[PDB]
Amino acid sequence: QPRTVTVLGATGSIGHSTLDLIERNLDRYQVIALTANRNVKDLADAAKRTNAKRAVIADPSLYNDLKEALAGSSVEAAAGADALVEAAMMGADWTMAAIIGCAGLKATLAAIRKGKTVALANKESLVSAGGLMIDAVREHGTTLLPVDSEHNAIFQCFPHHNRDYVRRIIITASGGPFRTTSLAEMATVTPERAVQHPAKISIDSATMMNKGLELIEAFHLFQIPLEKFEILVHPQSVIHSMVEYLDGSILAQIGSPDMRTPIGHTLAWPKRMETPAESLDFTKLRQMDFEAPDYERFPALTLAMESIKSGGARPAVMNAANEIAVAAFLDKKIGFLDIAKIVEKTLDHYTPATPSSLEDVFAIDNEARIQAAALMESL
């Protein structure tokens, strides 16, 4: 009766919101494995609270701490990169892939190959290994469920088994901190101001690279022609995305910013479940605004568009190059508007062959990073 559950990256924000829903219904779920990287405390605590079968700490050096933290406990202990992959293969009917970056690609792909249900929080997967990821889903009949806000909104409004019914998919975007800033002023932006907030996430938001990546991710998740995707600027961020059908009918997913709504969706799918998420009060909201994205002020959107259009290792290169360029800006080595410049340069000087395995992906990423760092230190 209990549905077995595993969470890769159980100690981050997603991992937390996830366990929050699992522990509220501990009677419906049987936790198999929980993972963390260096936060042995939360990991062992979470493991013990849910009476998980295994707890894995990524960092091999923290192996003895986990083992000691779980002393007298029935939870098994493990550490290292391989242990993550092994935990992803333990057989959980529902797996939350919350380990981000190249570090979670192996585990995520392993979980997918198991053919059960995989809630994807690791969006980066699709940008660098989208093609492979989708092949494995097709091959193993895996149920892939997007956890991220935009893709989850789209999924809830999407006609699965009938892509042909979609006229367009609108990915709403807040616009970022510089939604009303001129290119001229953006040139003088400092890492301090750019990150000001409610690290890299902040900067991808400011350059709108996060929307370029989300578009790429959506492209692989929904298998729809690129010309059917649109980015719509909507400051309030209350509408999380929309899908227009052939009869002109447009379905939209709206709600508060509580991550437990989408996570709750992916956790209960195909059924729905209660989550303490707040009920959007349209009266206090009063207003909703919409405008077109400025492709001239945010060229990253263009770089993203072309990469997918071109295909192959393009998006991988772009994303890798962005990592370098953003870190440079933060390290005050470059100017804000240079980030998109470096990414564009790299995309033009490095165009490897499409990946066939994760090993190729890891390679391209590493190469792109080296190429980018080079160009980055030219001007």
- The residues binding ligand NDP (CB under 6 A) are 9-13, 15, 36-39, 58, 99-100, 103-104
Selected binder of its own copies within 275, 307, 319, 322 (CB under 8 A): 275
Binding of residue 89 to its own copies (CB under 8 A): no
CA neighbours closer than 13 Å in the CB half-sphere of residue 153: 26
Q: Consult the annotation and say whether 214 binds a ligand.
A: yes
DSSP label of 9: T
With b for 16 or more beta-carbon neighbours within 10 A and e for fewer, the 167-182 pattern comes to: eebbbbbebbbbbeee
Task: Quote the tokens at residue 122.
Answer: 């690791």
Residue with tokens 């405008």: 291
Selected binder of its own copies within 13, 51, 162, 180 (CB under 8 A): 162
Selected binder of its own copies within 67, 151, 211, 265 (CB under 8 A): 265
Please tell me the distance from the alpha carbon of residue 107 to that of residue 86, in angstroms, as a whole number: 8
Selected binder of its own copies within 56, 78, 170, 221 (CB under 8 A): 170
Kindly tell me the sign of the dihedral angle through the C-alpha atoms of 148, 154, 155, 157.
Answer: positive
Give the interface segment with its own copies, choosing from 36-44, 127-135, 266-274, 339-347 (CB under 8 A). Answer: 266-274
Binding of residue 274 to its own copies (CB under 8 A): yes
Spatial strand order in the sheet of 166-173: 229-233, 166-173, 239-245
Report, in Å, the least distance between residue 288 CB and its own copies. 4
Selected binder of its own copies within 268, 305, 337, 373 (CB under 8 A): 268
Report, in Å, the least distance between residue 103 CB and its own copies. 29
Question: Any idea what the Cα angle at residue 248 is, between residues 242 and 250, rounded to 5°?
Answer: 20
Strand partners, 94: 5, 117
Selected binder of its own copies within 64, 249, 356, 357 (CB under 8 A): 249
Task: Quote the tokens at residue 293.
Answer: 């994205």
Q: Consult the annotation and say whether 116 binds a ligand.
A: no
Report, in Å, the least distance between residue 126 CB and its own copies. 22
Binding of residue 42 to its own copies (CB under 8 A): no
Whether 149 and 253 have beta carbons less than 8 Å apart is answered as: no
Give the interface segment with its own copies, choosing from 132-140, 176-184, 252-260, 324-332 (CB under 8 A). Answer: 252-260
Q: Does residue 238 sit in helix, strand or coil?
A: coil
Q: Among residues 17 and 307, whose Cβ is nearest to ligand NDP?
A: 17
Classify 76 in phi/psi space as left (phi over 0), alpha (psi -120 to 50) or beta. beta
Q: Consult the annotation and say whether 122 binds a ligand.
A: yes
Using CB positions, name the residue nearest to ligand NDP. Answer: 12
Report, in Å, the least distance between residue 157 CB and ligand NDP. 28
Selected binder of its own copies within 141, 271, 296, 331 (CB under 8 A): 271
Interface residues for its own copies in 299-358 (CB under 8 A)? none
In this structure, what is the dihedral angle of CA atoms 187, 190, 196, 199, given to the nearest 10 degrees?
Answer: 100
Report, in Å, the least distance between residue 12 CB and ligand NDP. 2
Question: What is the pairing mode between strands 166-173 and 3-8?
Answer: unpaired
Question: What is the pairing mode between strands 3-8 and 94-97?
Answer: parallel
Question: What is the pairing mode between strands 166-173 and 229-233?
Answer: parallel
Which residues contact its own copies by CB under 8 A? 156-157, 159, 162, 165, 167-168, 170, 232, 234, 239, 242, 244-256, 258, 260-262, 264-265, 268, 271-275, 277-280, 282-283, 285-292
User: Which residue positions form the known binding site for NADPH?
Assistant: 11-14, 38-39, 122, 124
User: Which residue positions form the known binding site for Mn(2+)?
Assistant: 148, 150, 214
